[PDB]
Design a protein around this nucleic acid. Structure first.
Ligand SMILES: Nc1nc2c(ncn2[C@@H]2O[C@H](COP(=O)(O)OP(=O)(O)NP(=O)(O)O)[C@@H](O)[C@H]2O)c(=O)[nH]1
Ligand code: MET
Ligand SMILES: [Mg+2]
Lengths: 92, 595
RNA sequence: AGCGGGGUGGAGCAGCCUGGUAGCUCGUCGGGCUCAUAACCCGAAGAUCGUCGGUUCAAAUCCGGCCCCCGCUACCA
């Protein structure tokens, strides 16, 4: 339900790299090696192909970022119906 | 006991401000400086004896005395950047001399000087230079205008009359009534215009006697000072000296100043209290900022005079702040309360992310800061001193995240051995200079050169777009495989060797091996040119068909660079080709769908 | 361009030559075994043969025309 606020933007998980590292495709047509904060790492399980919010790192904000929130099925369905995001971004 | 009145000279660039003072002193200073412009304010004392020698029988026309001990002249830059120096000179001095060239008329600096004089209610008399520019004028060494006028013809006199009439009319729409010194009798609302010649000393005596005489008419009671009271003066500048440390040059005008007296000076953040250690005095008839002769140390000085004070802990002194003598703690508190009623005329705005600039005085730093701020350039730090090692470290720290803002601009300073070695090792650029514009323009042009070099090598990396169509003609096919030799006409874009071609479905037909319009070897083909391509990996039929349209494979980074960086070198055919290529490629990646 | 070879469940191969059931291994879905997963067992779905025509009592099998794929050679702007 919460939306990106600032430099944050959506993203689609592509492949997990191990040791809490994911490979997320963002809305600006860039692939980023993203790091999962440990606070939500322990309680929220993330799997390839999900809509998430990613904030790029302050330095070298082109290939690194942090994942802050995961969108459930109802939230992504509501977003698709509202029209803030399209279907081809999710499906690739 | 009457103190020497303080006279401030104001005017525009190249209007003979320094030359008049040089002629009065009979010394050459105007040729010393670089660029012909004086960027430092100074105070000079003129003894009354040379004043009397310069003058003559004219002193007997006015019923007064020459009991004035002397004169205290202050020079002032006329450049646009040094506004604060002009303001300080206008506020501090008791009398002003505006020097305006007759030929050029009026300049914005003259208007600003008049505005400052009106704001600080300083009476003044107008001077006129460049008299020799009028044709048919004879030159004689040091004669008054009254003696010179009879030596000229009617044409020069009438031209002079017209020019001064125009000047008086100008002052009139500036709301000021003007009349010639020998052509007016009122001396409370009417000014006086003295036509002078700096290069040949014409009319200097009239101006000198007028300055001597007008002092006691408007206000003379302000010129009486007790010779035993506490010292009271103001700061003129703050500069570094070899062997003495941070010293300040001040003009004492109240009381008497002795050595070891405690003084109160308004610092940047709060008042500072220190004990005087060294009192230094310039030689008579010598510019204070030009130490031609050796300074004479002096135990005590009496108002009014310009002296250099060397005391500990003066590195945070504010230019223009007053100095008050205080021998007792209650006097110290009263001086602190007096200082608390003082405003900082100029404050620098630092953005914490900017360049590092260092000068030798506070006024030069203010001028440089204003000139940089006029061009929208942030300033990380401004202070007084030579370029040290930590400055290079700070510059490297700023450069780490901003290539164009890590640089040092030194204005009349020195670079240490360790600092220059570290700068050479870590490749940090330093621009040293003595002239404000000659120093700023160098930085601007270096920034422009770096900017152009940023994209000079970027062009070679990207690949131009291109769309072509095979001839439906059998003739153009000259070899089928290894290599495939077939003619082509260009629809849009530019063909280059070593560029991959793809179809709508994106099959790798290979890489163009060679292009030839004839038996001769070619390099590239532009719009409306036919060329036979010899390509590898392409075979007629299964891989390519006659009459089929071929597209150049494009890199998305190259497309972004073309649409954002190299947007100047894009024309109709190129943009049409790139747009339709994006439309075609909008099949798998939504990036081309959104273009 | 000329010559030669081949198209069969989602994938890779038999079934031709000698016409008359369309099989083999992997893969998907469901149930079994185990505390659970993999391995293993059971059952079921899935091609009507690249299209069109000729022949024959009857054609994936014999024949011919097209569509596509693969290989070899000639082929210098
Ligand atoms: N022909 C002629 N040239 C003059 C006369 N007075 C000065 N000049 C020349 O004109 C120039 C004036 O420069 P300067 O002495 O700097 O003027 P200023 O009054 O100090 N202005 P600033 O220091 O800001 O430029 C010099 O080159 C000087 O030789 C004059 O009466 N006649
Ligand atoms: C080479 O033979 C040449 N005439 C083929 C066509 S060039 C466009
Ligand atoms: Mg000058």
């Amino acid at each position: 339900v919460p939306l990106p606020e600032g430099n944050q933007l959506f993203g689609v998980v592509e492949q997990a790299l191990g040791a809490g590292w994911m490979d997320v495709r963002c809305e600006d047509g860039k692939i980023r090696r993203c790091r999962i904060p440990g606070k939500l790492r322990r309680r929220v399980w993330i799997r390839v192909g999900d809509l998430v919010i990613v904030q790029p790192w302050p330095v070298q904000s082109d290939k690194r970022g942090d994942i802050v929130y995961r969108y459930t099925q109802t939230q992504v369905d509501w977003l698709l119906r509202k029209g803030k995001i399209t279907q081809e971004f999710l499906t690739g | 006991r009457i103190r020497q009145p303080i006279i401030a000279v104001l005017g525009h660039v190249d209007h003979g401000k320094t030359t008049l003072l040089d002629r009065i002193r009979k010394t050459n200073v105007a040729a010393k400086e670089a660029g012909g412009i004086t960027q430092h304010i100074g105070a000079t004392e003129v003894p009354i004896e040379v004043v009397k020698k310069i003058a003559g029988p004219l002193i007997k026309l006015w019923k007064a005395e020459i009991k004035l001990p002397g004169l205290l002249f202050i020079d002032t830059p006329g450049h646009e950047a040094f506004t604060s120096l002009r303001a300080r000179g206008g506020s501090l001095a008791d009398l002003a001399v505006l020097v305006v060239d007759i030929n050029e008329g009026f300049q914005p600096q003259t208007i600003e000087s008049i505005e400052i004089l009106r704001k600080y209610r300083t009476p003044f008399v107008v001077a006129a230079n460049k008299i020799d520019r009028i044709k048919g004028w004879v030159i004689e060494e040091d004669e008054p205008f009254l003696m010179n006028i009879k030596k000229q013809d009617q044409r020069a006199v009438q031209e002079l009359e017209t020019k001064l009439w125009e000047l008086i009319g100008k002052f009139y729409e500036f709301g000021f009534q003007a009349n010639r010194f020998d052509r007016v009798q009122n001396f409370t609302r009417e000014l006086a215009i003295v036509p002078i010649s700096a290069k040949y000393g014409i009319g200097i005596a009239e101006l000198l006697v007028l300055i001597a005489g007008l002092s006691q008419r408007y206000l003379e009671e302000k010129l009486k000072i007790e010779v035993e009271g506490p010292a009271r003066g103001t700061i003129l500048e703050v500069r570094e000296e070899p062997g003495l440390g941070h010293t300040i040059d001040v003009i004492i005008y109240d009381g008497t100043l002795h050595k070891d007296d405690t003084i109160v000076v308004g610092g940047k953040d709060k008042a500072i209290v220190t004990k005087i250690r060294a009192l230094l005095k310039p030689k008579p008839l010598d510019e204070i900022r030009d130490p031609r002769f050796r300074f004479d140390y002096v135990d005590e000085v009496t108002a009014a005079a310009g002296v250099k004070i060397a005391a500990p802990g003066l590195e945070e002194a504010l230019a223009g702040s007053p100095v008050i003598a205080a021998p007792t703690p209650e006097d110290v508190e009263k001086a602190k309360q007096e200082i608390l009623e003082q405003i900082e005329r100029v404050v620098i705005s630092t953005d914490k992310v900017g360049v590092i600039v260092k000068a030798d005085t506070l006024g030069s730093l203010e001028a440089l800061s204003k000139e940089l701020q006029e061009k929208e350039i942030p300033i990380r730090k401004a202070d007084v001193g030579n370029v040290s090692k930590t400055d290079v470290m700070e510059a490297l720290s700023v450069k780490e995240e901003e290539p164009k803002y890590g640089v040092i601009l030194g204005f009349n300073v020195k670079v240490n051995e360790d600092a220059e070695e570290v700068a050479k090792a870590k490749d940090v650029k330093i621009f040293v200079g003595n002239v404000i514009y000659k120093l700023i323009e160098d930085y601007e042009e270096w920034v422009k050169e770096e900017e152009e070099k940023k994209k000079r090598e970027l062009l070679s990396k990207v690949t131009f777009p291109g769309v072509i169509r095979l001839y439906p003609d059998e003739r153009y096919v000259f070899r089928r495989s290894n290599p495939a030799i077939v003619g082509i006409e260009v629809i849009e874009g530019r063909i280059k060797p070593g560029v991959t071609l793809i179809k709508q479905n994106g099959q790798k037909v290979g890489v163009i091996r060679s292009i030839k319009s004839r038996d001769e070897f070619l390099q590239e083909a532009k719009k409306g040119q036919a060329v036979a391509i010899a390509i590898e990996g392409a075979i007629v039929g299964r891989h390519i068909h006659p009459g089929e349209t071929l597209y150049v494979d494009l890199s998305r980074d190259d497309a972004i660079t073309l649409l954002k960086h190299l947007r100047d070198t894009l024309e109709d055919t190129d943009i049409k080709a790139l747009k339709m290529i994006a439309k075609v490629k909008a099949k798998e990646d939504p990036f081309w769908r959104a273009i």
